[PDB]
């Protein structure tokens, strides 16, 4: 499979309460591996995956400094953004930023992205070609024009093709035990009488990694995405993911229905039938 590395950044201004809240989280695929929270006591980039703990002092000092330069830029941007939109300098605002790289099965650069939002809406984003930007509004255009003049996409593109991809691969080799694993879903179904003419069937998928999974229902072998209920995939909290799909059925027809689980960690798609 193809793999990804992603960093998420949220900075929230807090007028009256104190200096802005900054939080950063680093992902490789669906595993968190680092973090930084300005409100925390360490003031360090902190390891949150066993495989990153391998890394030496040169590394943590490096990351720590960089995440603080990241935090400080956002300190400035909150001010600049507020100014651009002529906003009462007294109100809590949010800047979010996400950037990173994907690689293919061959672990070679595949895709690059950089995305920026202000107060929950798109602000600016590097386009797929990694050379130009999509600006969401007149404020964003000002940033675009500024960033175009100073050849910023060029610097970013350098990183997303180069460093990002190279260190992604480093994290995959070093974290081979876990990042490159697949945990097949543990499945089972449950039955629930709701009326004298109606019963709820539920299909369960637990312990699976990565979060990507599909559970669909079929009557007599024909799909029923129309009549089911998927729940948003959710974290167990131990590095794995969970999901259920439910369908309400007429009494006595339970045998007609089947759940079809598809997950990277399975050899061929799982059919679970209501066999008595």
């Amino acid at each position: 499979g193809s793999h990804s590395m992603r960093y998420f950044f949220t900075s929230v201004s807090r007028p009256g309460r104190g200096e802005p809240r900054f939080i950063a989280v680093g992902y490789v695929d669906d595993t968190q591996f680092v973090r930084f929270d300005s409100d925390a006591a360490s003031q360090r980039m902190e390891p949150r995956a066993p495989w990153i703990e391998q890394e030496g002092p040169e590394y943590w000092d490096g990351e720590t400094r960089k995440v603080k330069a990241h935090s400080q830029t956002h300190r400035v941007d909150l001010g600049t953004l507020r100014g651009y939109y002529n906003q009462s300098e007294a109100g809590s605002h949010t800047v979010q930023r996400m950037y990173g790289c994907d690689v293919g099965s061959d672990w070679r650069f595949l895709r690059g992205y950089h995305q920026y939002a202000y107060d929950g809406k798109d602000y600016i984003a590097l386009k797929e070609d990694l050379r130009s930007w999509t600006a969401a509004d007149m404020a964003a255009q000002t940033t675009k024009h500024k960033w175009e003049a100073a050849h910023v996409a060029e610097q970013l593109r350098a990183y997303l093709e180069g460093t990002c991809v190279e260190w992604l691969r480093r994290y995959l080799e070093n974290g081979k035990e876990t990042l490159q694993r697949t945990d097949a879903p543990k499945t089972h179904m449950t039955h629930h009488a709701v009326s004298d003419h109606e019963a709820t069937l539920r299909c369960w998928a637990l312990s699976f990694y990565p979060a990507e999974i599909t559970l669909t229902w079929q009557r007599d072998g024909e799909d029923q995405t129309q009549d089911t209920e998927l729940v948003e995939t959710r974290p167990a909290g131990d590095g794995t993911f969970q999901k259920w799909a439910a369908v309400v059925v007429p009494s006595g027809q339970e045998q007609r229905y089947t759940c079809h689980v598809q997950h990277e960690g399975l050899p061929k798609p799982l059919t679970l039938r209501w066999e008595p």
Partner: peptide, 9 residues
């Protein structure tokens, strides 16, 4: 591995 820097909006 973070960006060595980010340029102000």
């Amino acid at each position: 591995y973070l960006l060595m820097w980010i340029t102000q909006v």
